[PDB]
């Protein structure tokens, strides 16, 4: 127990901002005393022996909310002199001792990241992201958020770097692999929108290493096909779709997912006179898959889910709608 | 002899855990059995119906030098109930079973067997008693289970190896809390056949102080074994615990 003294440090450093706010007409004295009191009690709560990330988040919300109130009120008072720097800095220091005391909270980490990102400190943000990744190397969500921030900024090489280290690590779930394929194909789409990547062999390659991944499942390849089937308005999209189809046909031939992708395969970038023709083609695929020797319950569940999405989209013909309804009822 | 089914009583012994069963013409040494009603090696065990589940196990001193030392009356063996107990020399786990019964369901024993078939016996007794984990590898290379043994408080050691002092030195350096307690068994014929055993004992002691211990008790467990000395010392400090 030295908790009073440690608080004495932090509150005493808090002092001169409050001195200035006293000296301005922004707050009155009783309010000031209220503020100091609340701050002292919170700081003692933080430096208590048994503390918890919820308490941390409570405190930082208090301070950040104070910053916003101060901003609104000095705006109403039309005063431009006050800054937010000291509040943001002390806010940071809260986050720093928070991660020293409890490093093991994804929740507190993401709160930290979001705080930095909303106030505009990207170098610091990358550093914080670094430490958090180092402490929790199995977390697909952090891996994704880092890499997606890097891709949105545009630094594609570091995006790939985070993602490759993450796929090197998190080999239990396919989740990072789907996310990396997602953002990689998004980068290809960024290149096409700007108009090697002329080939764009990289999702084929990650599919190839997926083939020897530990989670390597038929349902895994199915969700792979799903996220590939997203945003089919590309160039080599038909190439990669043919590739994933023939690979899973070669590997899991009579799997009901293989029959599902055999149905939904020619529907890459379609919305429209090309719509019902490919609809009838995939419907022939569907009738063939239904009559084929597959697990008809599994395949029919796949098909009624895909039909649930199909009926979720609008703008179709009623005869087609009802024959889908009948083919669903017959399952 | 102390034939089966006799009515004897049990009283506490001054070390915690161990009790003494006295009765009729026989007084003998015993410990609360964790896994009730199941022998280890065809050892004798003592039932008692309390106003059912509770049963004890006798030790043979002739079998375990740990037992023999206690009967000789060492001062303190440092292994109170709750204490993490490293063993060295898990010779099929008989005394290891006994020491597990000492340290109870809250304690821990980490054991070292190097031979394989003895290890089969050992892991069998580990499969029965949950508080002992076995370790089958070479005790000379505590790198082999540095991932597997956390910080323990008492090192029992009873290997018959000539490098015994440097063995216990390295295993202590990797596995012992400041304020370490250890017991070690000395077979003078194994260390140095030619020499007088008391001097053999002394040389062992001086190697141990060279490896930074402090001896505090020592006796010949004489009327249970010839030419063996139990040595009790502390790692790195003087008083025992902390």
């Amino acid at each position: 127990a030295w908790v009073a003294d440690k608080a004495r440090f932090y509150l005493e450093r808090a002092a001169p901002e409050l001195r200035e706010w006293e000296e301005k007409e922004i707050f009155t004295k009783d309010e000031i005393r209220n503020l100091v009191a609340k701050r002292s009690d919170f700081e003692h709560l933080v430096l208590a022996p048994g503390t918890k990330p919820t308490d941390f988040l409570n405190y930082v919300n208090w301070e950040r909310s104070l910053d916003r109130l101060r901003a609104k009120r000095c705006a109403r008072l039309n005063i431009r002199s006050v800054t937010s720097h000291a509040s943001q800095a002390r806010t940071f220091g809260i986050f720093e001792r928070a991660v020293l005391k409890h490093p093991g909270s994804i929740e507190l980490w993401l709160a930290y990241l979001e705080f930095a990102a909303q106030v505009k400190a990207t170098k610091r943000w990358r550093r914080i992201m670094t430490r958090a990744l180092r402490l929790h190397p199995m977390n697909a969500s952090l891996w994704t958020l880092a890499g997606r921030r890097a891709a949105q900024n545009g630094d594609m090489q570091r995006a790939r770097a985070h993602f490759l280290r993450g796929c090197r690590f998190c080999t239990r779930e396919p989740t990072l692999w789907l996310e990396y394929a997602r953002c990689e194909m998004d980068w290809l789409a960024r290149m096409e929108a700007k108009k090697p990547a002329l080939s764009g062999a990289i999702p084929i390659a990650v599919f190839d290493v997926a083939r020897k991944q530990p989670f390597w499942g038929p349902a895994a390849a199915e969700k792979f096909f799903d996220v590939f089937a997203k945003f089919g308005h590309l160039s080599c999209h038909e190439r990669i779709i043919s590739h994933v189809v023939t690979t899973m046909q070669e590997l899991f031939p009579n799997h009901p997912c293989t029959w599902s992708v055999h149905i939904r395969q020619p529907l890459v970038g379609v919305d429209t006179p090309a719509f019902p023709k490919a609809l009838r083609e995939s419907l022939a695929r569907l009738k063939a898959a239904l009559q084929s020797t597959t697990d008809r319950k599994a395949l029919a569940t796949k098909m009624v889910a895909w039909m649930d999405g199909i009926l979720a989209i609008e703008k179709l013909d009623a005869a087609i709608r009802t024959v889908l309804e009948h083919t669903k009822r017959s399952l | 002899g102390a034939k089966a089914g006799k009515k004897v009583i049990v009283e506490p012994h001054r070390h915690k855990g161990v009790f003494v069963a006295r009765g009729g013409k026989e007084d003998l040494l015993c410990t609360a059995n964790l896994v009730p009603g199941e022998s280890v090696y065809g050892e004798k065990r003592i039932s008692v119906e309390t106003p059912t589940k509770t049963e004890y196990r006798i030790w043979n001193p002739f079998r375990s030098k740990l037992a023999a030392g206690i009967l000789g009356g060492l001062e303190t063996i440092y292994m109170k109930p709750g204490s993490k107990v490293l063993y060295l020399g898990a010779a099929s786990g008989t005394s290891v079973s006994h020491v597990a019964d000492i340290v109870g369901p809250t304690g821990a024993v980490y054991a070292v067997e190097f031979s394989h078939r003895s290890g089969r016996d050992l892991i069998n007794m580990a499969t029965r008693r949950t508080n002992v984990i076995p370790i089958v590898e070479d005790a000379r290379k505590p790198m082999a289970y540095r991932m597997l043994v956390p910080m323990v408080d008492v090192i029992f050691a009873d290997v018959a190896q000539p490098d015994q002092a440097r063995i216990v030195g390295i295993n202590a350096r990797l596995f012992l809390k400041q304020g370490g307690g250890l017991l070690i068994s000395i077979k003078a014929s194994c260390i140095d056949s030619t020499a007088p055993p008391e001097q053999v004992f002394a040389s062992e002691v001086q190697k141990l102080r060279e490896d930074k211990f402090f001896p505090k008790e020592q006796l010949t467990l004489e009327p249970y074994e010839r030419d063996h000395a139990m040595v009790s010392c502390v790692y790195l400090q003087k008083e025992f615990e902390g």
Partner: protein, 131 residues
């Protein structure tokens, strides 16, 4: 999920944590006789076995339990008591063994040796003086 508590708010200790709860000894007079026997286990062996004379004045341990040997699977041809010798009590066992004659013999020796010159002797003298 979050329910009302129960209130239950209303000396030397009872069972021993540091020895896996040997209970405090209930003191049946049979147990007291047993302990008397055990403190005298020296004279039980009529010279055939001497023990370390562990004698406090207070022959009672504040913690104890009455037990029985189970089974030595190594030795089951003699190292086990027969049914007609599986007695309920220690003193019953030492009763059922032999040398009770020898006990009686030594006791009557000491009976003589202390009846030696005490009172019947003197009465015999005063009688053969009065006659």
């Amino acid at each position: 999920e979050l329910s009302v508590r129960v209130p239950q708010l209303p000396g030397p200790p009872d069972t021993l944590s540091d020895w896996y709860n040997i209970p405090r000894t209930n003191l049946t007079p049979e147990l007291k006789r047993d302990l008397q026997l055990l403190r005298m286990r020296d004279v039980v062996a009529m010279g055939k076995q001497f023990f370390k004379k562990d004698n406090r004045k207070d022959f009672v341990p504040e913690y104890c339990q009455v037990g029985t040997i189970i089974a030595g699977a190594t030795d089951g041809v003699s190292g086990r008591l027969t049914r007609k010798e599986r007695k309920r009590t220690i003193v019953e066992e030492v009763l059922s063994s032999d040398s009770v004659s020898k006990y009686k013999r030594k006791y009557h020796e000491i009976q003589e040796h202390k009846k030696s010159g005490r009172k019947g002797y003197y009465k015999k003298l005063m009688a053969a003086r009065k006659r």
